[PDB]
C-alpha cells in the first residue's frame, strides 16, 4: 500500500515525481490512463494530475 | 553422376548439341550416351514405404515400444504380432521377429 501527498522528491531531469513508493514519491498515469481520461473527455483531471500534481511549468514563447 | 576417369572429379553435362558430352576442369570427356539423356525426373508419392522405413520396419519386432496385436503369425505360429502404422495413408504393416512381413514393405 502507498499514499503520497503533494510534496516529495522530483526528478532532476524532467521535474516529475520519482518512481514508486521506495523513492518516497510517484505512482503513474501511463498512456492508458490518459487515453481513458480523454475518452471520458476529462481534460480538467488531466490538467490537474499531469500539470499541477506533476511537472507543471509555464513556458514563454516570443 | 559422372566422375572423371583421370582426376576423379564431377563432370558437367553441357548438352551440345544432339549428344551429351561431359566436361571436366582437366578437359577430359567421356561421351555419355543413351541413358544419360535423362535430365530431371519427379514421380509423385515416391521415396517412402519400402525405402524410407526399411531400417525401422526391420527393427520393429525387436523394439519393445511397438504396439502388438493378437494376430497369429503365419510363418512361425507365434500368437502375437508386431503392428505398425506408417505415413499419412496409415498403412498397417504386421511384422514378426521370425521374418514375416505381411507383404506391406
Amino acid at each position: 500500500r502507498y499514499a503520497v501527498a503533494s510534496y516529495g522528491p522530483t526528478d532532476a531531469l524532467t521535474g516529475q515525481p520519482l518512481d514508486g513508493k521506495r523513492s518516497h514519491g510517484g505512482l503513474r498515469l501511463g498512456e492508458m490512463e490518459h487515453w481513458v481520461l480523454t475518452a471520458q473527455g476529462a481534460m480538467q483531471t488531466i490538467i490537474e494530475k499531469s500539470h499541477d500534481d506533476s511537472d507543471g511549468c509555464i513556458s514563454y514563447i516570443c | 553422376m559422372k566422375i572423371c576417369k583421370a582426376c576423379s572429379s564431377c563432370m558437367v553435362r553441357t548438352y551440345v548439341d544432339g549428344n551429351i558430352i561431359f566436361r571436366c576442369s582437366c578437359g577430359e570427356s567421356v561421351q555419355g550416351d543413351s541413358q544419360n539423356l535423362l535430365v530431371s525426373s519427379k514421380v509423385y508419392h515416391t521415396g517412402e514405404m519400402e525405402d524410407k522405413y526399411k531400417i525401422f520396419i526391420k527393427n520393429a519386432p525387436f523394439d519393445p515400444t511397438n504396439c502388438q496385436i493378437k494376430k497369429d503369425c503365419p510363418n512361425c505360429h507365434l500368437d502375437y504380432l508386431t503392428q505398425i502404422c506408417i505415413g499419412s495413408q496409415k498403412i498397417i504393416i504386421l511384422v514378426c521377429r521370425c521374418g514375416y512381413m505381411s507383404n506391406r514393405g
Binding site: G30 | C4, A6, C7, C26, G27
Partner: protein
C-alpha cells in the same frame, strides 16, 4: 596379376630429382618435421596400419594433382584459358601440335584409382607404397619417352616442373625453419596454442540452437507496449 614394391624406381626418381630418396618415400608424411630431418630419413613414421591413415589420402592427393596437371597438359587445345604452367610450357607449340598433343601424349592414368581403392580397403601400407610407386612410374615413364623430340622436350619440362612443385608443396606443409616473424604486419604474432588471444566470446559456449539468427519483431510476451507498474502486475494474474 600380382604387384610388388620396387624401391629402384623410387631411387631413380630421387636421383633424377637430385634429392634424397628419403624425401620421395616420405610424401604426405613430413608434417611436424623439418626438411633437414626429412633428408636424413630419421623419424620416419611406420608404414600405415589402417585404412584411416591420412598418409594414404595425402599421397593419393599428390598423385591426383600430378594426373590432373598432366590431363590439363594433354587437352590444352580444349581450354579457352589453360592454367599458368601449361601455358608457359605449350606457348611455343603450333595449333596443329596443340591438337595433336591429345593424340601423342600417353594415357598414364592407367588403372590407378580402382586398384588404389582396392589396396586401401584391403591393405593400407601397400596402398601407400603403391601410390608412391605409381607417382614415380608415371613421372619417369613421361620423362623417359623418346619419340618424337618436341613432345620429348615438352613432357620432360612438364614432368620436372610439376614434380618439383609437388615436392615444394609437401615441404611447405612441413615444419618451418628458423626465421624472423616480422613478415606479418602486426606488432605481434600468435601461435597454434594461443590461449592468450582467444575469443572468450566462444568460451561462453553457444548452448542455444538459433543464436546467429536475429529476431527484430516485438516479442509476443512482453509488456513493452502495455502500461502497468510493479505490484500492479498482480492484476494480470489468472482469472
Amino acid at each position: 596379376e600380382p604387384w610388388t614394391f620396387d624401391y629402384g624406381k623410387i631411387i631413380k626418381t630421387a636421383k633424377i630429382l637430385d634429392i634424397s630418396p628419403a624425401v620421395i618415400e616420405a610424401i604426405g608424411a613430413m608434417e611436424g618435421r623439418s626438411y633437414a630431418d626429412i633428408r636424413e630419413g630419421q623419424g620416419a613414421p611406420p608404414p600405415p596400419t589402417s585404412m584411416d591413415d591420412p598418409r594414404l589420402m595425402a599421397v593419393d592427393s599428390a598423385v591426383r594433382i600430378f594426373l590432373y596437371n598432366y590431363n590439363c597438359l594433354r587437352h590444352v587445345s580444349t581450354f579457352n584459358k589453360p592454367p599458368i604452367h601449361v601455358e608457359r610450357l605449350v606457348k611455343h607449340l603450333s595449333y596443329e601440335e596443340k591438337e595433336d598433343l591429345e593424340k601423342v601424349l600417353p594415357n598414364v592414368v592407367n588403372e590407378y584409382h580402382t586398384t588404389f581403392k582396392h589396396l586401401r580397403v584391403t591393405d593400407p601400407a601397400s596402398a601407400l607404397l603403391y601410390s608412391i610407386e605409381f607417382l614415380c612410374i608415371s613421372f619417369l615413364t613421361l620423362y623417359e619417352i623418346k619419340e618424337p623430340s618436341w613432345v620429348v622436350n615438352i613432357v620432360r619440362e612438364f614432368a620436372l616442373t610439376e614434380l618439383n612443385t609437388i615436392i615444394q608443396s609437401e615441404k611447405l606443409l612441413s615444419k618451418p625453419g628458423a626465421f624472423n616473424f616480422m613478415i606479418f604486419g602486426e606488432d605481434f604474432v600468435c601461435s597454434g596454442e594461443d590461449s592468450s588471444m582467444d575469443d572468450i566470446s566462444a568460451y561462453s559456449s553457444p548452448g542455444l540452437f538459433g543464436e546467429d539468427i536475429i529476431d527484430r519483431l516485438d516479442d509476443p510476451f512482453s509488456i513493452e507496449d502495455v502500461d502497468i507498474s510493479l505490484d500492479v502486475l498482480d492484476n494480470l494474474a489468472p482469472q
